[PDB]
C-alpha cells in the first residue's frame, strides 16, 4: 500500500522504494486510518443507484477492516430483506459491528426479491463502513455508507486534525425495480431518481397535513 | 470534487479527560467522538480522494491473501516496512541509503585537530 | 528424504494484476494462488525438513502460554526480537555488538587532515 504524509499543508505520497531522510515519525498517534465518503465527489447518492451500485456472488469469504476517523454523512443506508418465500437475503450483523454513528439522512429500506446467493458487494469494489469498521459486505438491520480508506501520518503541529426514511424493494434491479417510499401502510409514493431527501421530507409533511395510497408529482453537489 | 472537509475523528487524544474514562460512567455510544472541519488548502483533499480511489486496488489485493476477518495489524506492518526500508540490518552512513546526519561531527573533529 | 520440491505459494506478489483484484470479479477460491518447483541444491530442502521437525517443539511451547486461537502476530514478534537483539536502546559502534560500518569514515577524516 502507499502512504501519504502531511507537510506544510501539502501532501506527499511516499513511494515505497524511495528514501526520505527528511521524514519524521514520533508515534502511532501521528498515524491515522481514515474512511471517506462518496459524497464529496458528486456521485449519485440516491436509493435506485444504491441498488445499482451492488451485486451478489458466493464462494468468497467475508473481509473486514478497522478505521479510526472519517467524514460526516449526508446520506446512509440500511436493509432488512428476505426472498419471495419470506426467507432471509443477507448475513447477520455480528457483535461489535454497529450502525455508522453519523447520518444526516437514512435511506432505510425493506422488501424482498430473488436475492441470488452470495453477498452484497459493490460494483467498483468499494467498502461498507460501520462503527469504526468497514468491509465489503452488508449485514442486516445496520446503518453504513459506501466509502474508501486512507492511511496517513500527521506532524506534531497544533491543529488536532436526525432523520429516518422507509422504502420497499421490488425484485432488486433485475433490469427492474419499482421503489416506493412509505408514509404509512395506506400511503406510498412512486420514488423518482433525481428527487432529494429534502424534497421528500416536504412531501411527507404536506401530505401529513392533507389527511395522510400511491401518488406522483406529475412534473449537483449540495455544498453550494 | 468537494473542497470542503466537514470531517470527524474519535475522542482518543491524550489530555481531554478528568475521570469520565470509567466504563459505565461514560457514553460508549455517541459521546466518545470528535468532529472538525477544514477547507481545501492547495487542492489537498481532492488529491487524497484521488489517492484513496487509487489505493483500493492494492488494498484489496494485499488483503486477499489471508483468511482473517477483522484486520488490525496492517498499520504496524506498514511502519515496520518503513523501518526495514530504513534499516535492513546494515547501514552505510556515506552510502546515501541509511539517512543519518553525521556531517557536523567534523566540527568537533576540527576542534580537536586545532588542539 | 525427498530432494524434490514441487511446491506452491499464494499469489500475493506485487505487479501481477490489472484490475482483477475486484472481489467478486475474482476467484477467491482456487485462482488466488501460485505454484513452483525446485531441486535439492546443496541438501538444502532436506536440511530444512530436519529444521522443521526440530522447530515443532519450541513452537508448541512458545504457543502454549496464551489462550488465543488463531495466531497471526508471531512473525512480527520474531522480527522485533531480531531488532532488539540488534537494538536494545544503546549502541557501541566499536563494541562489536551494534553492527554498523563506520570504518570508511576515516577516509574523509584523513582527507580533512591532509587539508
Amino acid at each position: 500500500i502507499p502512504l501519504g504524509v502531511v507537510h506544510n499543508n501539502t501532501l506527499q505520497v511516499s513511494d515505497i522504494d524511495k528514501l526520505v531522510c527528511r521524514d519524521k515519525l514520533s508515534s502511532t498517534s501521528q498515524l491515522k486510518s481514515v474512511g471517506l465518503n462518496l459524497e464529496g465527489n458528486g456521485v449519485a447518492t440516491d436509493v435506485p443507484t444504491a441498488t445499482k451500485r451492488w451485486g451478489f456472488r458466493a464462494g468468497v469469504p467475508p473481509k473486514v477492516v478497522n478505521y479510526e476517523a472519517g467524514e460526516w454523512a449526508e446520506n446512509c443506508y440500511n436493509l432488512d430483506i428476505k426472498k419471495a418465500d419470506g426467507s432471509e437475503c443477507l448475513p447477520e450483523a455480528p457483535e461489535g459491528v454497529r450502525g455508522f454513528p453519523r447520518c444526516r439522512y437514512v435511506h432505510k429500506v425493506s422488501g424482498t426479491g430473488p436475492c441470488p446467493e452470495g453477498y452484497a458487494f459493490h460494483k467498483e469494489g468499494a467498502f461498507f463502513l460501520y462503527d469504526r469498521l468497514a468491509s465489503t459486505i452488508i449485514y442486516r438491520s445496520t446503518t453504513f455508507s459506501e466509502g474508501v480508506v486512507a492511511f496517513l501520518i500527521l506532524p506534531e503541529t497544533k491543529k488536532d486534525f436526525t432523520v429516518t426514511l422507509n422504502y420497499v424493494a421490488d425484485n432488486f434491479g433485475t433490469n427492474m425495480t419499482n421503489f416506493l417510499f412509505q408514509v404509512d401502510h395506506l400511503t406510498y409514493v412512486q420514488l423518482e431518481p433525481r428527487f432529494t431527501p429534502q424534497f421528500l421530507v416536504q412531501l411527507n409533511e404536506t401530505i401529513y397535513t392533507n389527511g395522510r395510497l400511491i401518488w406522483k408529482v406529475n412534473p449537483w453537489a449540495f455544498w453550494e | 470534487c468537494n473542497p470542503n472537509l466537514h470531517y470527524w475523528t474519535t475522542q482518543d487524544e491524550g489530555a481531554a479527560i478528568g475521570l469520565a474514562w470509567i466504563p459505565y460512567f461514560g457514553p460508549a455510544a455517541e459521546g466518545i467522538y470528535t468532529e472538525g472541519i477544514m477547507h481545501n488548502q492547495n487542492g489537498l483533499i481532492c488529491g487524497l480522494r484521488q489517492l484513496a480511489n487509487e489505493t483500493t486496488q492494492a488494498l484489496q489485493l494485499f488483503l486477499r491473501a489471508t483468511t482473517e476477518l477483522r484486520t488490525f495489524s496492517i498499520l504496524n506492518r506498514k511502519a515496520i516496512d518503513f523501518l526495514l526500508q530504513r534499516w535492513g540490518g546494515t547501514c552505510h552512513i556515506l552510502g546515501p541509503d541509511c539517512c543519518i546526519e553525521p556531517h557536523d561531527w567534523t566540527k568537533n573533529i576540527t576542534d580537536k585537530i586545532d588542539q | 528424504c525427498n530432494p524434490n520440491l514441487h511446491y506452491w505459494t499464494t499469489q500475493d506478489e506485487g505487479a501481477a494484476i490489472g484490475l482483477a483484484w475486484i472481489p467478486y470479479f475474482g476467484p477467491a477460491a482456487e485462482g488466488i494462488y501460485t505454484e513452483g518447483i525446485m531441486h535439492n541444491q546443496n541438501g538444502l530442502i532436506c536440511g530444512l525438513r530436519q529444521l522443521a521437525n526440530e522447530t515443532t517443539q519450541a513452537l508448541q511451547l512458545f504457543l502454549r502460554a496464551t489462550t488465543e486461537l488463531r495466531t497471526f502476530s508471531i512473525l512480527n514478534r520474531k522480527a522485533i526480537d531480531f531488532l532488539l537483539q540488534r537494538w536494545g536502546g544503546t549502541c557501541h559502534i566499536l563494541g562489536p555488538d551494534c553492527c554498523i560500518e563506520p570504518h570508511d569514515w576515516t577516509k574523509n577524516i584523513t582527507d580533512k587532515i591532509d587539508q
Epitope: 502507499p2 502512504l3 513511494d15 | 480522494r49 489517492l51 487509487e54 486496488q57 492494492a58 | 505487479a15 484490475l19
Partner: antibody, heavy 120, light 106 residues
C-alpha cells in the same frame, strides 16, 4: 491534450537511458500513465504504469527490476530510467494515458509518437 | 499468463461490406475487453471499452460484443481508412495483447 516523445536512440547492448514524455492540456496528476512496446515485425504488449501521484507503480515480468518508472506531476512530465539492454528491448515505446479518472484504470485513450529504441 | 486469440489474422474485403472479428483467450473475463486500431506506423486509438461501449470520435459503423472468454467485433460498412490494423486488448488481470487483425483487397 498533446503528448511528446523525446529521446529515441540507438544505444549499445547493456546500455541505459532515461526517456521522458511530456503532456499538456489536461489534468495530468489526475490520470495514469504507462509505457507500451511495439516490437517491429510483430504486435503489442504492456510494460509498466503508475498511480496518479507516484505512490504505486507496476511493471511487466520480462523487464521487472531492470527499469524504473518515474514521473513529475509538478512538470506533468513522465519519465523512465532504463537499465541493461538486450535485443527484444529493440522496439518502439509509447507514452499513453488511461480512460478512467484518478489514474485508477487501463484501456488507454490516446498515444504519443513512439520511439524506436534499439541496440547494436 | 493469459493469451488472447485474434481470429483471423487478416482479411480481404471491399468497401461497404459488413465484417466481423472474433477474439478469444484462455480464461473467462467479465466483458472487460477493449479494441484498438492503428496503421502502418501510426499511433493507435481507443475504440471500445468493455467490448460494448464505443467512444467519442468512433463511427457507429462498428459493433463490439461478447462475454466470458469469447469476444467479438462487427463492422456494418467498410471504409478505406477502416482497412487498417485492429487489436484485441485484455485488461482483466495481465493487461496484455495478442497478434492483431488486418484488412485487404484483391
Amino acid at each position: 491534450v498533446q503528448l511528446v516523445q523525446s529521446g529515441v536512440t540507438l544505444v549499445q547492448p547493456g546500455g541505459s537511458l532515461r526517456v521522458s514524455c511530456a503532456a499538456s492540456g489536461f489534468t495530468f496528476s489526475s490520470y495514469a500513465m504507462s509505457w507500451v512496446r511495439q516490437a517491429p515485425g510483430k504486435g503489442l504488449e504492456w510494460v509498466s504504469a503508475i498511480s496518479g501521484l507516484g505512490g504505486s507503480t507496476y511493471y511487466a515480468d520480462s523487464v521487472k527490476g531492470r527499469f524504473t518508472i518515474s514521473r513529475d506531476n509538478s512538470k506533468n512530465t513522465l519519465y523512465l530510467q532504463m537499465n541493461s539492454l538486450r535485443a527484444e528491448d529493440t522496439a518502439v515505446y509509447y507514452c499513453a494515458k488511461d480512460h478512467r479518472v484518478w489514474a485508477a484504470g487501463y484501456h488507454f485513450d490516446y498515444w504519443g509518437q513512439g520511439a524506436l529504441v534499439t541496440v547494436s | 499468463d493469459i493469451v488472447l486469440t485474434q481470429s483471423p489474422s487478416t482479411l480481404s474485403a471491399s468497401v461497404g461490406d459488413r465484417v466481423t472479428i472474433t477474439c478469444r483467450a484462455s480464461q473467462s473475463i467479465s466483458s472487460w475487453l477493449a479494441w484498438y486500431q492503428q496503421k502502418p506506423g501510426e499511433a493507435p486509438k481507443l475504440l471500445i471499452s468493455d467490448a460494448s461501449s464505443l467512444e467519442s470520435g468512433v463511427p457507429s459503423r462498428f459493433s463490439g460484443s461478447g462475454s466470458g472468454t469469447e469476444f467479438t467485433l462487427t463492422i456494418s460498412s467498410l471504409q478505406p481508412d477502416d482497412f487498417a490494423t485492429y487489436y484485441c486488448q485484455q485488461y482483466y488481470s495481465s493487461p496484455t495483447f495478442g497478434g492483431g487483425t488486418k484488412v485487404e483487397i484483391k
